[PDB]
Amino acid sequence: QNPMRDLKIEKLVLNISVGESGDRLTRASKVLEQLSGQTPVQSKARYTVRTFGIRRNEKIAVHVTVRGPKAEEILERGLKVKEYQLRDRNFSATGNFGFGIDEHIDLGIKYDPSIGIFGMDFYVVMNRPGARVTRRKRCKGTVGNSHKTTKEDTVSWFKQKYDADVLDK
């Protein structure tokens, strides 16, 4: 049986970790909202080091969290730029995954000379239902190990879609 333990996506998220604060961070935010259609959320520091040249609360980053048909469309577009070929070494221990890239305009973007070039960190959260059974206020619970997700079932579903293979290890 497989009534509704069939797999799907929970969310896509897009992160950009700018080296410092400033016009660079504003431009990264502009890129993310131009793609997403929705305003982004900045990200502050945690502590201090000079090797990167940073301090506490210095506005290092930005990200966005998106869902649904738009998310999976962006995902499969990421896959076709990524030539439908990936790594079990890249793949995580849960079935969730992602990849960090350069040349963001490849996703079908009307480039502007101001923004320059920025690399990104895409991440993908797949699941089955019970998402709110863990993330609500009432009757909270930790899901069953059957309903949990894993490397093997997630990659098998992801491979039989597109018939797109990955590497051995």
Partner: protein
């Protein structure tokens, strides 16, 4: 490997309380609500508990003792159909109606109902059940919403307005009933009365009827079967207010069967714990099968 916690951790572990393990109460709020001014020694603190499932609402009048909480009244979307609502048993209006129902139930069972009648002609305004002169004061009750998000425009405050119109002295403020314009701190009684008699639901019915007939068939299917529309719903809500004020006296079911028959089927079909001798049989079977070297 990772699926094995430590003996010392699991030993020194302190559980929470039961309802907190089940994710159902906030003892902060429960303490603040049931705890009582100790100059008023045995006189209780009457909560109006409200809770929200999918496909039902619960509203109860509750007090607190040492063995367990104790109930006076109740109200249920799944017994509203006596008084004349068939569909939309989780909406703002049914919540209001349940509040009205539990109010009339309390004042009926305590004889406080002839005086402090409440409100029948409704317009959607803020007013509390101010006491009579030289007579008994109205019933003082405090809302308990458990874990539910206090937010402007909720069926919980709808139920609250139902109680306050039904004749319960609940203290509150008009700054969370829908129509409460944020910047201009005044309530809108016409929008509130519209939500009473079904404004937003009728808007949804109207839009589905003008554009999306396939969804108009998928849902409101009972309204198609019963031939309901955007004036009938107001009329039935009004007549249902009248029926609630008429006969709130809780005729319950007949149960179709008996207690020990329900229990007979459940106990028959039930499981049971594997006793000491058959535990010995289990370990002995493992021995004779596997430690007997196949």
């Amino acid at each position: 490997q990772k699926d094995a916690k430590s003996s010392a951790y699991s030993s020194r572990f302190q559980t929470p309380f039961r309802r907190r393990r089940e994710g159902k109460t906030d003892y902060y709020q429960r303490k603040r609500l049931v705890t009582q001014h100790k100059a008023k020694y045995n006189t209780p603190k009457y909560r109006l508990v409200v809770r929200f499932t999918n496909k039902d609402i619960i509203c109860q009048i509750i007090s607190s003792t040492i063995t367990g909480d104790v109930v006076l009244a109740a109200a249920y979307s799944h017994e509203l159909p006596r008084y004349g609502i068939t569909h939309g048993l989780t909406n703002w209006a049914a919540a209001y109606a349940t509040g009205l129902l539990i109010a009339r139930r309390t004042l009926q069972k305590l004889g406080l109902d002839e005086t402090y009648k409440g409100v029948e002609e409704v317009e959607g305004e803020y007013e509390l059940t101010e006491a009579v002169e030289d007579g008994p004061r109205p019933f003082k009750v405090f809302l308990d919403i458990g874990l539910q998000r206090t937010t402007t425009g909720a069926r919980v405050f709808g139920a609250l307005k139902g109680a306050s119109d039904g004749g319960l002295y609940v203290p509150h403020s008009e700054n969370r009933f829908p129509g409460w314009d944020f910047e201009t701190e005044e309530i809108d009684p016409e929008l509130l009365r519209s939500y009473i008699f079904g404004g937003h639901v009728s808007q949804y019915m109207e839009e589905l009827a003008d554009d999306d007939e396939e969804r108009f068939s998928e849902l409101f299917k009972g309204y198609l079967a019963d031939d309901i529309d955007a004036d009938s719903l107001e009329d039935i809500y009004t007549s249902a207010h009248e029926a609630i004020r008429a006969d709130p006296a809780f005729k319950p079911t007949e149960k179709k069967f008996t207690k020990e028959q329900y229990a007979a089927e459940s106990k028959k079909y039930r499981q049971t714990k594997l006793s000491k001798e058959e535990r010995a049989a289990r370990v002995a079977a493992k021995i004779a099968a596997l430690a007997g070297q196949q």
